[PDB]
DNA sequence: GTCGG
DNA sequence: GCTGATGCGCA
DNA sequence: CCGACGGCGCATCAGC
């Protein structure tokens, strides 16, 4: 059904192998870039030559594409798939808090499976233990209807703490997706601007409230502006429990809301491409500001921004609505 | 790994 | 304490 | 051993 589905799944697999096993992050990013441009390509790829025309596809992927098209597989990937060490390493990184270095360490110590990992809980830090505890639940996606209930709860409780907070659910949700990986909330409040923090514990108060009402159930990491943890909807009387979910909360200066909401709306790929296009135009964008780079590549003063579109205009891109910042694929008959 | 020098 | 490096996470 | 590739928050360590 997915047009060029075979190719893009191959490149995604290779990407995960480079990131997770090889610890080669640039090759990860190359394979990701290549799989992104191919999936958005509206034609059937017939040869490596044709793929090579696209930006991000060079000689080695085209070569891989030629092989895949001829044989229906890739020998490199078949060998990786056979390697139990490479497989277990790859698998352990799916646990939140376990990245490529801790996975490799664990596998070399004989920790190869989910069952093994539970038995070695005392090797795990808190982040990892919570990721393990909820590993099955965090695999599941969240239907938009549950996203709306999660929204209702978050916005009710923020308003209880202080009616001047504004919470905005970003991520896939803001891009209109029918299901989401997790819930990403952007928080602002007038006391926190880029120039001053006139109130203390602005993020901590909201988090405390969300735990007090037993929405937030666990914490992975927590600072002054970013919270990362776990939440769960209330189940009704006698109906089964809802799964636990990942929730991110990011407090952003009130005067930089637009760079903020652009960042937290994503997608990640869109952001990396948008920020890459800024660089070639002579700007640098982060979640706070868009700045010009001087002759030496040092950023200068923030430019004024009164809307998301102002950011796109500075870098000569047509505005793209949030729905159009998601990745997309094409189909065949 | 791909691109821009 | 500061800084800066590594590891992990976010979009 | 051509070097850039988006950019940053939190956690933890090392060297000063
Ligand atoms: Cl690399
Ligand atoms: Cl294969
Ligand atoms: Cl894009
Ligand atoms: Cl900044
Ligand atoms: Cl997407
Ligand atoms: Cl890179
Ligand atoms: Mn489809
Ligand atoms: Mn397309
Ligand atoms: Mn998300
Ligand atoms: Mn998230
Ligand atoms: Mn303008
Ligand atoms: Mn994500
Ligand atoms: Na197909
Ligand atoms: Na190319
Ligand atoms: Na992980
Ligand atoms: Na509501
Ligand atoms: Na903490
Ligand atoms: Na659960
Ligand atoms: Na561009
Ligand atoms: Na204005
Ligand atoms: Na990066």
Q: Which residues touch strand D (CB under 7 A)?
A: A 26, 29-30, 125-127, 221-226, 263, 268, 271-273, 275-276, 278-279, 284-288
Q: What's chain A's length in residues?
A: 333
Q: Write out the two tokens for A305.
A: 């921004």
Distance A217 CA to ligand 8 centre (A): 40
Domain count, chain A: 4
Query: Which is nearest to A270 in space by CA: A139, A174, A144?
Result: A174
**Among A241, A263, A285, which residue terminates a domain?**
A263
Does A114 fall in a domain? yes
**Among A222, A243, A263, which residue terminates a domain?**
A263
Residue A181 marked ligand-binding: yes
Q: How far apart are CA A327 and CA A311, in angstroms?
A: 20
Residues A221 and A285 in one domain: no
Give the CATH number of the domain where residue A45 resides. 1.10.150.110
Residues A155 and A216 in one domain: yes
Give the CATH number of the domain where residue A271 resides. 3.30.210.10
Q: How far apart are CA A234 and CA A217, in angstroms?
A: 11
Task: Compute the C-alpha angle A203/A205/A211, nearest 5°.
Answer: 105
CA of A9 to C1' of C8 (A): 25
β-pair type (A245-251, A183-188): parallel
Backbone angles phi, psi at A198, to 5 degrees: -85, -10
Those residues with Cβ within 8 angstroms of residue A127's Cβ, 6 or more apart along the chain or in another chain: A96, A97, A220, A221
Q: How far apart are CA A152 and CA A218, in angstroms?
A: 20
Residues A125 and A206 in one domain: no
Query: Which is nearest to A94 in space by CA: A19, A178, A7?
Result: A19
Q: How far apart are CA A290 and CA A304, in angstroms?
A: 8
Residues A222 and A151 in one domain: yes
Q: How far apart are CA A97 and CA A272, in angstroms?
A: 23
Task: Please count the CA atoms within 13 angstroms of the CA of A263 that sit on its side-chain side.
Answer: 18
Q: List the domain range (segments joined by +) for residue A227.
A: 141-263
User: Which is it for the CA torsion A130, A134, A139, A143, positive or negative?
Assistant: negative
User: Which is it for the CA torsion A222, A227, A228, A232, positive or negative?
Assistant: positive
Instruction: Give the determination technique.
Output: X-ray
Residue A242, Cβ density class (10 Å: 0-12 exposed, 13-18 middle, ≥19 buried): middle
Query: Which is nearest to A264 in space by CA: A283, A288, A284, A245?
Result: A288
Q: How far apart are CA A150 and CA A35, in angstroms?
A: 32
Residues A158 and A88 in one domain: no
Residues A178 and A251 in one domain: yes
Residue A262, Cβ density class (10 Å: 0-12 exposed, 13-18 middle, ≥19 buried): buried
Quickly count: other Cβ atoms within 10 Å of residue A331's Cβ. Answer: 8
Does A123 fall in a domain? yes
Does A331 fall in a domain? no
Contact between residue A100 and residue A108 where contact means Cβ atoms under 8 Å apart: no
Which whole-number Å values give the CA distances from A136 to A99, A146, A149, A245, A266, in the listed order? 18, 18, 21, 10, 25
**Among A237, A263, A289, which residue terminates a domain?**
A263
Does A46 fall in a domain? yes
**Chain D: bases < 7 Å from a protein Cβ:** 4-12
Contact between residue A85 and residue A107 where contact means Cβ atoms under 8 Å apart: yes
Token pair 């006391």: residue: A191
Residues A129 and A175 in one domain: no
Quickly count: other Cβ atoms within 10 Å of residue A84's Cβ. Answer: 10
Residue A160 marked ligand-binding: no
Q: Write out the two tokens for A29.
A: 């990013």
Does A332 fall in a domain? no
Does A208 fall in a domain? yes
| Residue A64 appears among annotated catalytic residues | yes
Q: Which residues pair with A246 in a beta bridge?
A: A230
Distance A273 CA to ligand 3 centre (A): 5
SS (H, E, C) chain A: CECCHHHHHHHHHHHHHHHHHHCCHHHHHHHHHHHHHHHHCCCCCCCHHHHHCCCCCCHHHHHHHHHHHHHCCCHHHHHHHHCHHHHHHHHHCCCCCCCHHHHHHHHHCCCCCHHHHHHCHHHCCHHHHHHHHCHHHHHCCEEHHHHHHHHHHHHHHHHHHCCCCEEEECHHHHCCCCEECCEEEEEECCCEECCEECCCCHHHHHHHHHHHCCCEEEEEEECCCEEEEEECCCCCCCCCCCCCEEEEEEECCHHHHHHHHHHHHCCHHHHHHHHHHHHHHCEEECCCCEEEECCCCCECCCCCCCCHHHHHHHCCCCCCCHHHHCCCCCECC
Residues A98 and A172 in one domain: no
């Amino acid at each position: 059904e997915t047009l060029n589905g075979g190719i893009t799944d191959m490149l995604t697999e290779l990407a995960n192998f480079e990131k997770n096993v090889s610890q080669a992050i640039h090759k990860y990013n190359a394979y990701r870039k290549a799989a992104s441009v191919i999936a958005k390509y509206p034609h059937k790829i017939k040869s490596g030559a044709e793929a090579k025309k696209l930006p991000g596809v060079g000689t080695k992927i085209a070569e891989k594409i030629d092989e895949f098209l001829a044989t229906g597989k890739l020998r490199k990937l078949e060998k990786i798939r056979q390697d139990d060490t490479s497989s277990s390493i790859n698998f352990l990184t799916r646990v939140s808090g376990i990245g490529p270095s801790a996975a490799r360490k664990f596998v070399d110590e004989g920790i190869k499976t989910l069952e093994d990992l539970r038995k070695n809980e005392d090797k795990l830090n808190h982040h990892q233990r919570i990721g393990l505890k909820y590993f099955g639940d965090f695999e599941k996606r969240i239907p938009r209807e549950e996203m709306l209930q999660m929204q209702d709860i978050v916005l009710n409780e923020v308003k209880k703490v202080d009616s001047e907070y504004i919470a905005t659910v970003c991520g896939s949700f803001r891009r209109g997706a029918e299901s989401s990986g997790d819930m990403d909330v952007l928080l602002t409040h007038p006391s926190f601007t880029s120039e001053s923090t006139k109130q203390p514990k602005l993020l901590h108060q909201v988090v405390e409230q969300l735990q007090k009402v037993h929405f937030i159930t666990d914490t992975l990491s927590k600072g002054e502006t970013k919270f990362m943890g776990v939440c769960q909807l209330p189940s009704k009387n006698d109906e089964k429990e809802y799964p636990h979910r990942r929730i991110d909360i990011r407090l952003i200066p009130k005067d930089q809301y637009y760079c903020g909401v652009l960042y937290f709306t994503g997608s990640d790929i869109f952001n990396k491409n948008m920020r890459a296009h800024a660089l070639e135009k002579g700007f640098t964008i982060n979640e706070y500001t868009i700045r010009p780079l001087g002759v030496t590549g040092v950023a200068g003063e923030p430019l004024p921004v009164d809307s998301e579109k102002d950011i796109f205009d500075y870098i000569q891109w047509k505005y793209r609505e949030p729905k159009d910042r998601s990745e997309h694929h094409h189909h065949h008959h």
